Every structure is written in structure tokens, then in C-alpha cells.
Design a protein around this ligand. Sequence first.
Ligand SMILES: Cc1cc2nc3c(=O)[nH]c(=O)nc-3n(C[C@H](O)[C@H](O)[C@H](O)COP(=O)(O)OP(=O)(O)OC[C@H]3O[C@@H](n4cnc5c(N)ncnc54)[C@H](O)[C@@H]3O)c2cc1C
Ligand SMILES: Cc1cc2nc3c(=O)[nH]c(=O)nc-3n(C[C@H](O)[C@H](O)[C@H](O)COP(=O)(O)OP(=O)(O)OC[C@H]3O[C@@H](n4cnc5c(N)ncnc54)[C@H](O)[C@@H]3O)c2cc1C
Ligand SMILES: CC[C@@H](C)Oc1cc(N)nc(Sc2cccc(Cl)c2)n1
Ligand SMILES: CC[C@@H](C)Oc1cc(N)nc(Sc2cccc(Cl)c2)n1
Ligand SMILES: CC[C@@H](C)Oc1cc(N)nc(Sc2cccc(Cl)c2)n1
Ligand SMILES: CC[C@@H](C)Oc1cc(N)nc(Sc2cccc(Cl)c2)n1
Ligand SMILES: CC[C@@H](C)Oc1cc(N)nc(Sc2cccc(Cl)c2)n1
Ligand SMILES: CC[C@@H](C)Oc1cc(N)nc(Sc2cccc(Cl)c2)n1
Ligand SMILES: CC[C@@H](C)Oc1cc(N)nc(Sc2cccc(Cl)c2)n1
Lengths: 486, 487
Amino acid sequence: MSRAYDLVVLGAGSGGLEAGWNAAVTHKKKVAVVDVQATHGPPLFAALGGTCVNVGCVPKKLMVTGAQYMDLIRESGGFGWEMDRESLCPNWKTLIAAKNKVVNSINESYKSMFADTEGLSFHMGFGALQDAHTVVVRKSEDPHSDVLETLDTEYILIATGSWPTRLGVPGDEFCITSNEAFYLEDAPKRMLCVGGGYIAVEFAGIFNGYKPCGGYVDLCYRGDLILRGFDTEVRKSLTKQLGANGIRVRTNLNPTKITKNEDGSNHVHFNDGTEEDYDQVMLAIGRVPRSQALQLDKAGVRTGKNGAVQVDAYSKTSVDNIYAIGDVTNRVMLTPVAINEGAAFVETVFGGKPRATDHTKVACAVFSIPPIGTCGMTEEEAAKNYETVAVYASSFTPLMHNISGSKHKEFMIRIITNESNGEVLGVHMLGDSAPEIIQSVGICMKMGAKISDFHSTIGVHPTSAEELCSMRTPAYFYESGKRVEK
Amino acid sequence: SRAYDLVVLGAGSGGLEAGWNAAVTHKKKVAVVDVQATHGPPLFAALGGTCVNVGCVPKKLMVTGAQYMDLIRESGGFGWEMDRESLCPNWKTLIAAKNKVVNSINESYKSMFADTEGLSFHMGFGALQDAHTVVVRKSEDPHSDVLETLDTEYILIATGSWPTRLGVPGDEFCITSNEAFYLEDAPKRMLCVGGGYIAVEFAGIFNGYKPCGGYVDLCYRGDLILRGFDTEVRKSLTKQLGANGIRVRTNLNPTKITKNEDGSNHVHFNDGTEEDYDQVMLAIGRVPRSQALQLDKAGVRTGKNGAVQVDAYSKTSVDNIYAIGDVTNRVMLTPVAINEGAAFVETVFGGKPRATDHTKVACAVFSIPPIGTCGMTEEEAAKNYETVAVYASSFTPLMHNISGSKHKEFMIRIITNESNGEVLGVHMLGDSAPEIIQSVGICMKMGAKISDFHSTIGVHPTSAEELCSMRTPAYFYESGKRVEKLS
Ligand SMILES: Cc1cc2nc3c(=O)[nH]c(=O)nc-3n(C[C@H](O)[C@H](O)[C@H](O)COP(=O)(O)OP(=O)(O)OC[C@H]3O[C@@H](n4cnc5c(N)ncnc54)[C@H](O)[C@@H]3O)c2cc1C
Ligand SMILES: Cc1cc2nc3c(=O)[nH]c(=O)nc-3n(C[C@H](O)[C@H](O)[C@H](O)COP(=O)(O)OP(=O)(O)OC[C@H]3O[C@@H](n4cnc5c(N)ncnc54)[C@H](O)[C@@H]3O)c2cc1C
Ligand SMILES: CC[C@@H](C)Oc1cc(N)nc(Sc2cccc(Cl)c2)n1
Ligand SMILES: CC[C@@H](C)Oc1cc(N)nc(Sc2cccc(Cl)c2)n1
Ligand SMILES: CC[C@@H](C)Oc1cc(N)nc(Sc2cccc(Cl)c2)n1
Ligand SMILES: CC[C@@H](C)Oc1cc(N)nc(Sc2cccc(Cl)c2)n1
Ligand SMILES: CC[C@@H](C)Oc1cc(N)nc(Sc2cccc(Cl)c2)n1
Ligand SMILES: CC[C@@H](C)Oc1cc(N)nc(Sc2cccc(Cl)c2)n1
Ligand SMILES: CC[C@@H](C)Oc1cc(N)nc(Sc2cccc(Cl)c2)n1
């Protein structure tokens, strides 16, 4: 070859590694993977494995499974599990500790992958494009810093992911993000989760589980109803159920000023003009793509909306040899997608047989308490897009919650079909095991299954999922975008 | 002509569904016979069927109770500190809280018959007089007082099934699923006999509710528990019951039982061991419940232990008489009996005929941990289809590194036909396996292929996302022979 390495991957991400690994193993290419550190934690947070492994899907989910024990301990008494309810409070310390261990052992698990894989090489620093075939690595985030390596390559892949959006407000410095939340010293007593994204909610769940006895948690959204882009009816039942679990949801209310107090605590001036004191305050505003210092303009790769790399369906950028995936594109900011985008890139480029990722009918989930599983069109956007649609609903309280005493925990299902053909466009579920159920739904919808296939499949009694196969007569319809009965 | 357009013998999961549908969607005059209105002994079964009163409902509640044992224990790893000295639960407050819940269904159902015109409940022992008549009697003695005499166009037999006993000296001193539900106290020293889904579910329950110092033994005459399930699933489970403290015992059934001076039950074994247990449950299985209906009076046929002889549209030996659910002995699940009984209503009363699809029925075992399975076992698949490919994947969920239950391996095993890529079977052991499998059994109802499975996008992080990563078979079968690659 004319060059040194075949591939370079900026960012050792869920998407990045998958690509880098596959190219190196199934195609034996020489592949380098750049990231900013090897083990998780501050100051950089993200590390080997990506945002999902170090400060996302893994640690998050562990804490969520921790926070659930609050309910499950409480629920147990109804089935005759008697015990000391005076020791009401958990230990945040022993959770974070136990979490770190687990996340850490992945970073180990990955180091020895690069060691064990020939072709694959990890390169710790800040990746930056020199030109279309060269990638500078630097020790410091300052672009003028010491230059650590200079990688030469046929193809470049940008899997640098995304970074928390701040709100530019007086006192922003004193707030935290998803990233900092994971390495908090102690459990916040008086907590304020700002925003209404899936992060905002997941975390409100977590802190509400791990609050010290006497603490409370406030959610705070500028809009009307939390989690836009989800089935409104699901969003409401959830907004209630967070309430029922003790999360004080607050709407049409964002803060305007934050000021640190003489005892360390954070004082918050609000939208309406309220003043309040919280130990911590987290910003789940969202995530901007992480392209802001890579020097894309040096190479001729294009930025669009907040650095979103400009990319076609086969993941190719402005420059022919350069590609980009996952969160930096801003197509869909989930891992399984980024993995697939990065797998498809390897078959396209190195594997001969080209292919692009199918972004329709991607199932996904929110690990709130209780959690949501959704795949497909929201009923609002479905009736607007397709001419005639039929909306099926079903809410039931599981039989067990008569005994557990959590009668607030309504399991909900909402199927949204095209009426003409009977095809399932969307399925929306709130309740425990909704993330597990939905996956297998998203397979049915990948085939484009119809409501006939759903109800006319035999049941698995007793489950929550068996109420997919009973959904027969629509609760109501839409006729040309018009909320209709007939 | 007739005073009822249909009589149901047995207010069952299948029965009610049929009786309700005929009465409501078709406005027929329908009577439903059962032996009582509320749950409990001596009869156990009541309004709602075996599932509602002494099956899927109470069982599942107890299972959800028994889980709390693990979940309490597991919580400590995530920093849930508390008094572990009070190690033991309260069986009494569980049974109590269970009864309430099952009871409120029996209420829920009484007022259905009240609120539904056409629908009428008739408490007694149903018995065929002839092809159009159904005698109701107060006592189980066939010669007893005659309470009603129902006349009808069509008769449906949804009388379900009854626990198989083992004819052994001391059988009287044992219990069944039915009695288990109304036990006074939690058995300390317990012996679950057999290796059916009941046997296992219950071993799970008693092991959760044992007093501190008690133990639970499982006991099967065969090699490996739960025949008819994926062998590799059956083993990982047999280990995991062990790991939870259930002492599994194989090639060992008892031969004599004798009650002791302090009430307890003493058990002579297959191998010749002697042991003492507080209670001993028999999950041998369930024979159809046709043994006193006088089918021979009407000309309906019995076969293997009363199994009603029935065609695909659920029609029996006599044209106007039909039978469903457990009494047929096709598949002894509720969702099936419901569908068999729904299909019967469209066939007879609804004009448009239809028969129930017994292939690719998903189902589950609520062990701890539970199984979800739909389709062919790998053994029977390779024997039946020429070339098959078996995909496997066992992982330990990320959380069990912290909870300290590292024994809890979530397992998945897909079994395909290799020629076409079609998914014949899917087998899952682990928490949320029953919820996941339902949505699988929809894919397999369409006859989905392994291409559709792996090439669907993931829902990270779940157990179910490891269905959409299953790409290269661990091994194959070529004309019934265990092999890696072919020809
Ligand atoms: C709190 C949180 C929770 C989440 N939860 C879920 C969930 O439950 N389910 C789900 O499906 N998805 C979840 N996600 C989404 C998931 O993390 C991402 O969508 C996915 O990892 C995107 O892949 P990517 O390769 O584009 O970025 P990532 O996989 O995140 O890779 C980013 C990597 O690039 C490196 N990098 C960035 N810039 C540079 C540079 N200049 N030089 C060198 N290296 C660099 C970083 O150090 C990092 O390791 C979550 C995200 C967050 C933040
Ligand atoms: C412990 C246990 C657990 C179970 N768990 C599950 C599970 O988790 N999932 C699942 O799918 N299935 C389960 N089953 C199976 C389920 O209970 C039955 O297979 C199902 O209810 C069959 O429906 P059916 O209408 O045929 O009969 P059933 O619903 O069993 O109907 C029986 C009814 O008929 C009545 N009857 C009996 N004799 C007469 C007569 N001579 N005259 C009038 N009425 C009569 C009885 O009083 C009874 O109420 C379980 C069974 C048991 C015993
Ligand atoms: C009931 C709807 C009626 C009050 O109209 C509403 C309601 C609402 N919450 N926000 C608006 S406009 C709006 C948009 C973004 C942020 C905020 Cl605080 C308000 N209009
Ligand atoms: C202009 C708003 C900008 C600073 O970003 C913000 C501000 C805010 N209060 N909440 C969010 S999160 C958010 C709020 C409403 C709807 C949706 Cl979809 C997201 N983003
Ligand atoms: C097909 C679902 C339908 C039976 O509704 C449900 C769901 C559920 N979890 N429990 C019940 S109570 C119930 C009534 C009759 C038979 C059985 Cl097995 C259960 N009904
Ligand atoms: C109880 C009658 C005896 C002869 O037969 C037994 C004995 C026993 N321990 N378990 C059962 S139930 C059972 C045993 C093996 C395979 C299967 Cl599929 C079921 N039947
Ligand atoms: C392949 C091992 C070889 C001994 O075959 C085996 C093993 C076993 N446990 N039981 C049998 S026959 C058998 C069937 C029912 C009950 C009993 Cl105790 C034995 N054959
Ligand atoms: C046979 C492969 C099986 C063990 O899967 C593996 C392999 C491995 N090295 N780490 C894991 S850890 C893990 C944690 C949560 C979910 C899943 Cl699917 C896996 N699983
Ligand atoms: C792609 C492997 C995937 C299907 O298995 C799983 C499942 C799970 N719950 N956690 C993991 S750990 C992990 C490995 C790579 C990227 C990410 Cl985001 C997580 N792997």
C-alpha cells in the first residue's frame, strides 16, 4: 500500500470499536483507534468503550436496578416479607463503589482485546484531522499542544459521539450533567433534574431511589409534557407515576439564575420567580455532537447543525475516504444504531458488499421507574403522515399490585396501525418488562407485521405481553389527520 | 325448541370464554355449570376454572412472593442495608393476601352472570343424560338429588383436568397442587415429587417461604427434569435450582409413606433411603376430568384416561356435542383452551368455521429463574427436519456482578431449519423470558427466519437484544446427526 494503516477511528465508541474490531478481524486490515483515555472517570468521563460503556447504558442501568430495590423492598411486605423499615435509606457510596469496579473491569476487558488482537492498536490522546489521510494525536485539548503521534491512513472514521448541552445562564458553572452525576460523592438530598429528555427522567428515578431519608427530587421542564417524541398517553401515565413514586414533576418552568451558598448548597431562581435550595442540580438538556475541535474544515468534511457531520446513507462524508457514525451524525443517538452504522461501514468499504443502516422501526427504551418500550410511529405523526389510522389501547393493573399495594403501576400498551392495510406502524408500552418485550416486537415490525398477526397469535399466560395478542377492536381512529370515531 | 342454545359443563378459562361469547356476540341462551362459585376446598376449582382458582393466578402471586427472597438478598450489593436476622417470611400473610385477590375474581364473575342476559350460572355436578339434556346434581354420587335438568341444542365439555395420583402405600398422606394453595403453614422440610412444570414452580415457592432452618427436595423418576424442553435449558435450570438451595434428586421416586406420632410424614424411597418431611406434594401430572360425566350415556368417546375424542374443530363423537382445553389433552394451557373455546363459537354460532392452531404456541415455566419457550426442541427438530442449525448464547447479566447472584445465567437457544433459514424453535432461561417469548411466538406465527432476527436493530441494554446478535450456529444436525459443517 501507499500508506501506513488501512483505517483510523477517532473515538473508541460503541460504533467505533465495532467498526475497528470488524475491519481488523473479519478483514485483517491495519486499524488504529484513538480515544482520550483507557479507564472511565473524570475529567474526560468518556473512555475505551464509548459514552455507553463508561458514562451511559452500563453504569446508568446498574443505578436504575439499584433504585428499583426501593420499590421492591417496600412491595415485598404485602407478600409477607417482614423486616426493619426504620433503616429506610440506602448507601450511595457502596453503589458507586460497586459500579466503578464493574465499569472498570470492562476497561480492562478492552485493553487486553487490543493486546490480543493483531491489526488493532489503541492510541491515547486527542484525535484531530491534519488532512484527508492523516490524523494528528495530541496530549492536550489545546490544539497547539505537544503532538504525540501522526497516523497515516487510507480511510478515517469519526465515532466521537456527543457532549452534554449546557444552558447559557448565570450560574451554569455550579450545575452538573449526566457525566458528573456518575461520580458524585454523596447522594443528593434535595435534588433538581432539569429538562425532560430520557436522561432527565432516568436520573430523576435514580436519585429518588438513593435520596437520604428526608430528601426529595424535583423534575423541571420548559415544555408542557415531558419526553416529546413519545406516545402522549404513555407520557402522561408516566408523568403521573413519577409523581406517585415521589418525584415532584414541574412544567413550564426553567431556571434563570444559580448562586452557590455559604454552606456549599445551590440556590436557584426560577422561570416563574420562585427561589429554592437544592444540594445538586443536573442538566439533561440534551447532547450536541462532538466535532467542535477535530478540525474538519482542515480536511473538507462538513458541519451542519451544532457540528452534526454531514453524511449520506452509507455513512460517507463530504470527503470520499472519510466516514462518520453514531451520535456525531445526529441521525439516531442510540448505541445499537451506532454499532449497526459502524458494522455497515465495514461491509461497505472493506467487505465489498455495500449496505446502509435501516433507521425506520428501530426499537428503543427509557429506563424510568416504570420504564417505557416503544417502536415505530407516534399516533400523532402517524395520522398526519398516513391517511387513515386506527389506534388500539389497553391499560391494566397487574394482578400482583393488588397485594404489593403499588396500585398506581398501570401497565399500558398502545398499537397504532394503518387502517387500509392493517399494518402495525407503532407500538408503545409503559410498564415493567416493557424494554424486554418491545425488542421482539421490533422484529415483527421489521417484517411489517399486521394487527391480524398480533391478536391472532396464541397467548403466554400469565404475562403483560399476552395483552398484545388480545388487541382487536380500535378504541378510536384518525381519518386524514382528524381525531375520529368513524 | 330448546331452553338453552348451549350448556357448558365447567366454568373454565375455555368454558366461560365460549359461554360469554355465544351469549354476547351471538345473543344465544347459555348456561354454565360448575361445582362452586368461590375458590377453595373441598372442590378447589370454581367459577373461572382451574387457572383462576388453583393455577395461573394464585400460583403466580406466590412465585412473585418467593422471588422477593432473592431480590431482598440481591439488594445489599447495591447498598440496601438492613436487618438480615429477620430472614424469614410470613406464609400466613401471603395466603391471606392471595385469597382476598382470588376471591375478588369470583365476585367479579358472579356479577358478570348477573349483568349478562342469556348467561346463567348453575351450581352442581354436570352429567350427560343424553345428546341434548344435561342433568345437574348436588352430590358427586351420581344417584344423588337432582337439582336441575337443562335442555339444549349444543353441549360443550370444558371440565378440565385433575391431579394424577401415584398408587402407592401412603398416597393418602400426600398433597397436590390443589391442596398446596390452602396449606396452613409453610412446610419446613418439603418434598416436591415429579418433574413437571408444577413440580418445579412449587419447589421455587416453598423454597422462598421455608422457615429459617428448612429445606426443599425435588424428586424425579427420570434423569433430567422437565422433559419436552431444551435439554441445555433443562440442565442450566437444574443447576440454578441447586444454586438457590433446592436439592434436586433424580432416578428416585418414593415407595411407601407413613404418618408419624408428631404428625410429620416419613418417606421410604426408591433407593431405600428413609427421610422425614412436613409435607409432600405430587406434581405427577393431570388426567382429564371426564370420569363421572356419563359420556357413554350420550355416545361421546373416551380414549386415554378419559381424553375426550375430538376433531380439529373441537367436535366430539356426537355432532351437537363439543369439548375443549384440558379434557381433550391436546395442549393443557389456558390461552389454548380460551382459543379452542373462542373458535367453537365462530364455528357453531358464528357461521364462519375455524380450528385452533396448536403449532408455535408460546408458553412459560415460572420457576426461579423462569423459562420461556416456543417451537421445536433441538432433538425433535433434527429428527423431523433433515438439516438443522442450532444457535446458542449464554451470558451473565451485568447486574449480577454486583448483586452477587453470579449463578444466574440468561440463556437463549434458537433452532432453525438450515435449508430455508426458518426459525423452528426458540428457548430461553432467565428473568423476563416469559415476557420476551410472547413477542417471539408472533414472529414464529409468521414463520420468521434467522435473517429477520439478527438483522433487526437492538434495544440496548436488555436480555432480549441478544436475539438480534445470533448469527453463526454453534453446531448443526445433518439428517439427525450432531455435526459442525456439512457434506
Ligand atoms: C447518560 C447516557 C445514557 C445512555 N443510555 C443509553 C441507553 O440506555 N440505551 C441506548 O441504546 N443508548 C444509550 N446512550 C447512547 C449511547 O451512549 C450512544 O448513542 C453511542 O455510544 C454512540 O456511539 P458513537 O460511537 O457515536 O459515540 P460513543 O460510542 O459514545 O464514543 C465516543 C468516544 O469517542 C471519544 N472521543 C470523542 N472525542 C474525541 C477526540 N477529540 N479524540 C479522541 N477521542 C475522542 C470519547 O472519549 C468516547 O470514548 C446513552 C448515552 C448517555 C450519554
Ligand atoms: C397449579 C396449576 C398451575 C397452572 N398454571 C398455568 C400457567 O401458568 N399458564 C397456563 O397457561 N396454564 C396453567 N394451568 C393450566 C390451566 O389451569 C388449565 O389448563 C386451563 O384452565 C384449562 O381450561 P379449561 O376451560 O379446559 O378447563 P378449566 O379452566 O380447568 O375448567 C375447570 C372447571 O370445570 C369445572 N367442572 C369440573 N367437573 C365438572 C362437572 N362435572 N360439571 C360441571 N363443571 C365441572 C370445575 O369446577 C372447574 O371450575 C395450570 C394448572 C394448574 C393445576
Ligand atoms: C393548554 C395549552 C396552552 C396553555 O398553551 C400553552 C401551554 C404551554 N405549556 N406552553 C405554551 S407556549 C410555551 C412553549 C415553550 C415553553 C413555554 Cl414555558 C411555553 N402554550
Ligand atoms: C432554547 C432552549 C435551549 C437552551 O435548550 C433547552 C432548554 C430547556 N429549558 N430544555 C431543554 S430540553 C427540552 C425541552 C423541551 C422540549 C424538548 Cl424535546 C427538550 N433544552
Ligand atoms: C388473554 C388475557 C386475559 C385472560 O386477561 C387476563 C390477564 C391476566 N393476567 N389475568 C386474568 S384473570 C384470569 C381469568 C380467566 C382465566 C385466567 Cl388463566 C386468568 N385475565
Ligand atoms: C406417579 C406415577 C409414576 C408411575 O410415574 C411418574 C413418577 C414420577 N416421579 N413423575 C411422573 S411425572 C413425569 C415423569 C417423567 C417424565 C414426565 Cl414427561 C413426567 N410420573
Ligand atoms: C445414559 C445413561 C443410562 C444409565 O440410561 C439411563 C439412565 C437413567 N437415569 N435411567 C434410565 S431408565 C429409567 C427410566 C425411568 C426411571 C428410571 Cl429410575 C430409570 N436409563
Ligand atoms: C458466550 C458469550 C457470553 C458469555 O456473552 C458474554 C461474553 C462476555 N465476554 N461478556 C459478557 S458480559 C454481558 C453483560 C450484560 C449483557 C450481556 Cl449480553 C453480556 N457476555
Ligand atoms: C453488542 C453486544 C451486546 C449485544 O451485548 C451486550 C449487552 C449488554 N447489556 N451489555 C454489553 S456490554 C457492552 C459492550 C459493547 C458496547 C456496549 Cl454499549 C455495551 N453487551
